[PDB]
Design a protein around this nucleic acid. Sequence first.
RNA 1: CCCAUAGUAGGCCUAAAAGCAGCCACCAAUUAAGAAAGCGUUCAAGCUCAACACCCACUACCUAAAAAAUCCCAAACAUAUA
Lengths: 38, 96, 72, 175, 222, 162, 154, 45
Amino acid sequence: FKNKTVLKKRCKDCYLVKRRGRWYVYCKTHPRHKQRQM
Amino acid sequence: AAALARLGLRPVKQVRVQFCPFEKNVESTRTFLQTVSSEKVRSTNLNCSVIADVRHDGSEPCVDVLFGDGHRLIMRGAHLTALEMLTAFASHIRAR
Amino acid sequence: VQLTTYAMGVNIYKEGQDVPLKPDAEYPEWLFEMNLGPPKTLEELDPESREYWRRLRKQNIWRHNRLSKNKR
Amino acid sequence: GVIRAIVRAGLAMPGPPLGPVLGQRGVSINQFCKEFNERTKDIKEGIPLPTKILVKPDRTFEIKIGQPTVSYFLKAAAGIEKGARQTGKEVAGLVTLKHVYEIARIKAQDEAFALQDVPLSSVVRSIIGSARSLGIRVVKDLSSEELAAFQKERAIFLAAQKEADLAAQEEAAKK
Amino acid sequence: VKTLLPVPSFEDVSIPEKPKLRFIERAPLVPKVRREPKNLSDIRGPSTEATEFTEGNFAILALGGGYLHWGHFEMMRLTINRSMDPKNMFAIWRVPAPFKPITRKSVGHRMGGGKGAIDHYVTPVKAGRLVVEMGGRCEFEEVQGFLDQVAHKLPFAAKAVSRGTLEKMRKDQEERERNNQNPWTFERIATANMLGIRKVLSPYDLTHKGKYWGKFYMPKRV
Amino acid sequence: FREVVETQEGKTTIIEGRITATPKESPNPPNPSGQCPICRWNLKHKYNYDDVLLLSQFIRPHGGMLPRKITGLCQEEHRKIEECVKMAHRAGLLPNHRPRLPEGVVPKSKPQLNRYLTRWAPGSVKPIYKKGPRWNRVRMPVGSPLLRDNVCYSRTPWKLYH
Amino acid sequence: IPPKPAIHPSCLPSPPSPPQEEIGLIRLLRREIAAVFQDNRMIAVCQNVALSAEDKLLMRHQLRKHKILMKVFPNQVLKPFLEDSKYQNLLPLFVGHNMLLVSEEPKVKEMVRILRTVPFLPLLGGCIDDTILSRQGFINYSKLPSLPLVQGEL
Amino acid sequence: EALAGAPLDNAPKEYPPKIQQLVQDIASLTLLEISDLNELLKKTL
RNA sequence: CCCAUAGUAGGCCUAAAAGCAGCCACCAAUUAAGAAAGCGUUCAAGCUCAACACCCACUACCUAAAAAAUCCCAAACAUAUA
Ligand SMILES: [Mg+2]
Ligand SMILES: [Zn+2]
Ligand SMILES: [Zn+2]
């Protein structure tokens, strides 16, 4: 995960989720697009 | 209806549908037959086939399916929708 | 070195005698009713034809393509 | 599934493009090339034509021979060997309606047109659009007119090719 | 089925020569031998000139005051030249070349000895002044996109608006300013001097109507 | 309403689809000109989170909810019911609206801590250790931001941050 | 301070939306539907199979070999034409994906024998000279003898 | 004017009344009208 | 929420760039799809989107939060009437 204030989708398989108080960007095709809200 | 294609359709043997054209409660079985006779779900296996039976005085939208384990599953879509029977068939073919 | 270079030495008559060319009388008349240079716009076709709607659809596709260039 | 490939008839050596893909697919390549050569030996001109192949899960390929491309026929009917980089400001040649009509009526027997209710108007419009997108130009039916057109176009195209080669040499020299 | 609206045809907007932006130099052709003070009244308040459009239909509307040096102009012109279409878009500069001198002394020096030497040059920009104007035969999405991309990089607040957007924003602004519920307007209190408020206010607030403060601009003050 | 019935008899699963009965609305609405079920009964900004009868008519027996195309609420009224129903399952209200599970309710970990006006999830928020100085103190949220337009009788706004 | 209305706009009954003006696409669709319904006497509505375009062009070529055509229309433009004309008993047969057949002159034997090769091409039925029939109706009508002998047996 | 109720043939219970009327009209004679019918049928075909 | 055939390897230095290296025109067939609107490609394959066929909820109040050294600081109440 990478700390990012402005979250966005880097491809197509990225789906946004709301967990443990932070918005996370999970992706199964490209795992490099994992972002973490700070 | 890509879940049925991603899951699998090899152990199934023969499936068929029966309904009436003039009835107003045959759209569910119609779209079920349309989704089950697509391209991926049909090309994922060549050891199975489908039968499209259309009758006039049937007055019942029954769909009977069975796989290679000698079992039998018949689901009449008189009041059920398409997604319900789709996920039911998916669970029944995944669990066995 | 391989290349498909079969340019026949055609001068002024080798393009009609080498192949069985048919005169203008045997060819139908409706084969010359096609377009020539410039294509067809939108104000030259009546709104009761498929060509006008196809051209409008192509213009809409071009507009959508020109618009969707920065968004993801 | 299917693999799209456009190779030459009498020149089908095992390797370029049609090599790594055929190796990773699981089918042979030398046998395929030999079969394509023995099927294309009937052509006395070596015209490059597309090839549609199909592979079954038991590793067995089939060859379906169709009709050649349109750019080769257009270049053979016009007389020029290479296309121009511009259209309108630098015309490559002229082709009458008779030549494109013959090309269309010969090509309208492949696996793409014979399996569809397509008339002659559609195919002649398609070939006219292809000729316009290539770099040439169509015209009614000009006998003596196209004769004089060729007479002047030979000279003007020779001059255009000479000046284009000079410009390319200058650009190659400025390096 | 759905309807198919006709696409907006672009036939009355011809692209002139040199569609790209010109080069902006640092110091002008002649240096100023007389050191000028840092007059702060050149960026406080609304803008007077370079407000409406001229040729294009899209421009960046400024919402604050600030200075732009050579690096900012270079960044803007490079971004414009690298994010545009030379055959369909063209932009024209709206702000002049930087000419205001700024004197800077040596690092680690005592207070005194007169003013320092002139280093760089900046330009005054007020609120509501169009920074750059760009037109062409394009639509509104892409131009607004790559204009807000640069406006977010600017020091002061700036947005990418056009003609219809500016008209609509002015219309809603005047609608909100003419339909106020509470009958206590800042202008009525500042001009008529109510409750002795003129002691802590400023004489420039009579024309600003409480919409400006130093260099910022609050569009929600009404 | 409609339910699914699956029966096993001779290795032949019989999945039926019987439609049962369901009640309807009263044939005497106070405001028939309203476009929403809440507005037709003059309940605009007149309900709270303690009303277990109003919230039980737009949810599912297993804890789920119902969309806007089925109920009839608009955009701002559907979000208020979605927020008030979350404040009931945490305060011990609606005991019969628990989710189904095989056999997971075996180890009773944390005891039944009584709570009310719960806006956020318990096991998710972080404990405030600094609490800020004095002027910019970080207060604890309470209530709901969409329940501010309700009718009040205390001559003071609803203090949601204290 | 924004103006606070006494009645919220989402609570009061909204005015009706202005009806849009009909475009020429639907007009041409209805015109060609009426045209193909007046001249042709044999139609057969069948459920469109979501198959690949290869098999689609294959079956198109197999059908058009017997000098028949094929043309479909969307339900949005077809339901008014079916509810305002005489074909009011065919509206429940166009509730989803389907394919309409336009074949001139009665040739039900060859088309049935060429469509029964695939067991995934059903059909809801159709009318045979103002006589609505079903699939079993078609398969028992295709077994009728030749036209001249039936005309001359009386 | 719409169409008929679209019956089927697997359960013969109903028949069009026009056919019955025509049969009742043509099946109530001796042989002269049969000869006239044959004559008017062979006049064309 | 679904959905994608073809005239072709449209025109050209580089070996070829076959829909993303550059030029003016960016054609054309059945219902309907761009000589290419977003990733992976020396030259080909893999994925979506716009366009039919199909139903058709809001299809989006635009962006505006941060962590230093003795230990964080009064406590509490959204619901009896300004
Ligand atoms: Mg492709
Ligand atoms: Zn990703
Ligand atoms: Zn309401």
